[PDB]
């Protein structure tokens, strides 16, 4: 044992005796890193060998479980037009962003010397013009403008993608119907594919019981949000019969609706006695 | 706003929550507020002034003698290193100090010192939805207000680090252990209720309750109204959730 | 008690769900435990181990550390420039002309400064520019 | 660490946080763990 810091009850659990990962069957390639961030020599906390060397349990295998079969199956849900909408909105925002962030500031900052009204309406200076060259001799505005442009564009693109990341462009079962391949919107409007386990998908009731009235699913053409609980992600489907495959729709609905039960409303005078199962003590 | 200690509290957050919910002298002494430590008696050989350490062999102690009302301190602040093993006294005023080295256990010896600690304040526990009050009059003394409620239906169970890792990475084991502990909580509550019934049968009631007849009638009316509104909410929820139930 | 009716998966592990009530799962796999329900929280353990160790203190963002190239460039430049500052301001102020260069750059509106030239190329180039407004 | 191997490269992403001549990364420049 560490004679300066440790105790004699310091016995390492061997890697054989540690608990295997059984929570899910899908692999978790984050522990590998990426060829990109291995090439860039980036150090991440999620693929550090010391932190992945858990002493009591095992981290999940990077590859999916050998029992899983990834052969294509029945198509469940298909709303492809979302992609187009995605493109539209994304492109619109970008164009608007450009017009509202670069063209107008550029034209009113470099292509004229006359101020606009909002530059001096609250000031009590006499009227004067401005020049780009008699100010900021040591150019501290150049790094500021560059950083603002870079990070504003990054934030805009990333959060636009995050907003669209809930919606499901397409959802197709596996052959054994144990997996759901979900095509979603990429940052630039095209497709990106993910995989989920149907066992982890649940249509969870709201935490606030009074907010069930204020749901999209109340409408006949609203949205149905199904939570993947092994990753805490959301699958937003259009609840219109034209977007669904009738041959698998009822099975999917039955498998995903298990926690939205009658207890969510409460127990009446008769069900309160059956709310729990009695614990019998001393009967031996 | 209260931390979900199953998945988030690991070492210092976990120890702080242990100090809050158990009030164990070791844990409570680790996390005692620096602002105020509970005022004690005057040290004598029969009743020594007890200075606590959480498994540390010594502690710096300053003595100002027999504090009085006119002058808040008896003599000059004399510092020394109160060590573990015996009684030690300040030769200037004769105050006897005993260093109690608290252990990380649940022995009756530790529970003997349960009254020498301020209860741990829960206001700063959890996560705050207000940074700091901008009012100068109420600042550094008042705690920040909250827009949310503090739940009171949390029952904390201690687990070993190995078992906590298994709980985190094995949902089935987590559900099994949670249901077992819920059964244990039901059994414990029923046992306490039965003990109270036996005590009340043996010794009777403490006394009658001084109440007004107006308040009596209003309490009964409030109970009936609460039941009626619960029934109405049950019907409304059943109608709202019809498409999902 | 609305018990979990059936798990249709062929994974015998997921059969644990059928034992518990819907309300029981809703309490410990949703609401308060939403960010934990039905998930193996190995990442919590990995991130805790990342936080509590004496790691590299140069963090770029949450995911990654600072690239070692930037770190080493910053540290080497800091040490060398600090040594230059101390040595020059304590030992080499007898001849300002020898140990210092005179440099300057002014606004584009004003005519180009006398010292507005590239250093180390004073014997090669004469630098000038057109004024702008 | 010059001529003495104190650190454990099996427990570090990047060996080379300190000037040394006795350490080598387990995942080298051309190595990429993949599925």
């Amino acid at each position: 044992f560490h004679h300066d810091k440790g105790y004699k009850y310091d016995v390492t659990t061997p890697y054989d005796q540690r608990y295997n990962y059984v929570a899910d069957r899908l692999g978790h390639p984050e522990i590998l890193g990426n060829p990109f961030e291995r090439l860039m020599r980036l150090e991440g906390d999620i693929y550090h060998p010391n932190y992945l060397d858990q002493p009591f349990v095992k981290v999940p295998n990077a590859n999916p479980n050998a029992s899983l079969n990834f052969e294509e199956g029945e198509v469940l849900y298909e709303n492809t037009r979302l992609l187009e909408w995605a493109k539209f909105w994304n492109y619109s925002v970008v164009v608007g962003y450009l017009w509202c962030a670069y063209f107008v500031p550029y034209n009113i900052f470099f292509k004229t010397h006359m101020p606009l009204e909002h530059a001096y309406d609250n000031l009590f200076f006499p009227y004067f013009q401005h020049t780009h060259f008699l100010w900021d001799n040591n150019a501290l505005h150049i790094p500021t403008v560059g950083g603002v442009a870079i990070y504003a564009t990054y934030i805009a693109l990333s959060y636009i993608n995050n907003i669209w990341k809930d919606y499901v462009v397409r959802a197709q079962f596996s052959k054994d119907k144990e997996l759901l391949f979900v095509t979603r919107v990429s940052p630039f409007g095209t497709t990106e594919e993910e995989v989920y386990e149907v066992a982890h998908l649940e249509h969870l009731p709201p935490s606030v019981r009074s907010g069930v009235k204020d749901l999209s699913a109340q409408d006949a053409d609203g949205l149905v949000d199904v939570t993947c609980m092994s990753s805490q992600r959301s699958l937003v489907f259009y609840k219109g019969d034209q977007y669904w495959n009738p041959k698998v729709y009822n099975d999917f609905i039955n498998q995903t609706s298990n926690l939205w039960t009658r207890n969510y409303t409460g127990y009446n005078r008769l069900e309160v006695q059956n709310s729990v199962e009695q614990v019998k003590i001393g009967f031996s | 706003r209260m931390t979900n200690t199953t998945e988030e509290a690991f070492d210092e957050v976990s120890h702080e929550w242990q100090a809050l919910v158990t009030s164990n002298p070791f844990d409570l002494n680790v996390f005692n507020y620096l602002e105020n430590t509970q005022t004690s008696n005057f040290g004598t050989v029969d009743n020594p002034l007890v200075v606590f350490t959480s498994e540390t062999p010594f502690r710096y102690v300053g003595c100002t003698g027999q504090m009085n009302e006119d002058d808040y301190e008896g003599h000059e602040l004399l510092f020394f290193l109160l060590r573990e093993g015996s009684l030690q006294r300040c030769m200037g005023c004769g105050q006897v100090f005993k260093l109690v080295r608290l252990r990380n256990e649940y022995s009756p010896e530790m529970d003997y010192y349960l009254s020498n600690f301020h209860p741990y304040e829960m206001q700063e526990m959890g996560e705050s939805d207000t940074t700091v009050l901008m009012s100068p009059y109420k600042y550094a003394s008042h705690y920040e207000y909250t827009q949310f409620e503090t739940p009171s239906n949390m029952v904390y169970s201690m687990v070993n680090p190995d078992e906590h890792d298994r709980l985190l990475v094995d949902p089935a084991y987590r559900m099994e252990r949670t249901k077992a502990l819920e059964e244990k909580y039901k059994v414990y509550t029923s046992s306490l209720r039965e003990v109270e019934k036996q005590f009340e049968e043996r010794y009777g009631r403490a006394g009658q309750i001084n109440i007004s007849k107006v308040t009596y009638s209003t309490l009964i009316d409030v109970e009936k109204a609460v039941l009626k509104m619960d029934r109405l909410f049950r019907k409304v929820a059943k109608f709202e959730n019809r498409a999902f139930i | 008690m609305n018990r979990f009716f059936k798990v249709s998966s062929k994974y015998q592990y997921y059969k644990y769900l059928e034992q518990y009530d819907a309300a029981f799962l809703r309490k410990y796999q949703s609401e308060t435990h939403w960010y934990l329900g039905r998930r193996g929280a190995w990442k919590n353990l990995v991130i805790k181990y990342a936080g509590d160790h004496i790691s590299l203190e140069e963090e770029h963002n949450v995911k990654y550390k600072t690239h070692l190239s930037f770190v080493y460039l910053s540290y080497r430049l800091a040490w060398v420039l600090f040594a230059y500052v101390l040595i020059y301001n304590h030992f080499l102020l007898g001849d300002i002309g020898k140990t210092f260069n005179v440099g300057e750059w002014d606004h584009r509106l004003k005519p180009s400064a006398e010292r507005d030239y590239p250093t180390r190329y004073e014997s090669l180039y004469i630098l000038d520019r057109t004024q702008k407004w | 660490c010059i001529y003495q191997a104190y650190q454990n490269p099996l427990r570090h992403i990047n060996t080379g946080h300190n000037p040394n001549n006795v350490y080598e990364d387990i995942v080298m420049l051309g190595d990429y763990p993949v599925q």
């Binding site: 560490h2 004679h3 300066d4 810091k5 440790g6 105790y7 009850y9 310091d10 016995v11 390492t12 659990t13 002493p55 009591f56 614990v279 003590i281 001393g282 | 070492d11 990380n104 201690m158 687990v159 070993n160 680090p161 190995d162 078992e163 077992a180 502990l181 059964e183 244990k184 059994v187 414990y188 029923s190 046992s191 039965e194 | 181990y49 509590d52 160790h53 | 104190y6 454990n8 427990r11």
Partner: peptide
């Protein structure tokens, strides 16, 4: 010199690893 030490990698026994019986709880 001694190697690295992480005390969190070793099990500690502060809580019994079995749960009490219902009858034992009532009797206690």
């Amino acid at each position: 010199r001694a190697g690295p030490y992480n005390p969190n990698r070793y099990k500690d026994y502060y809580i019994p690893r079995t749960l009490p019986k219902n009858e034992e709880i009532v009797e206690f």
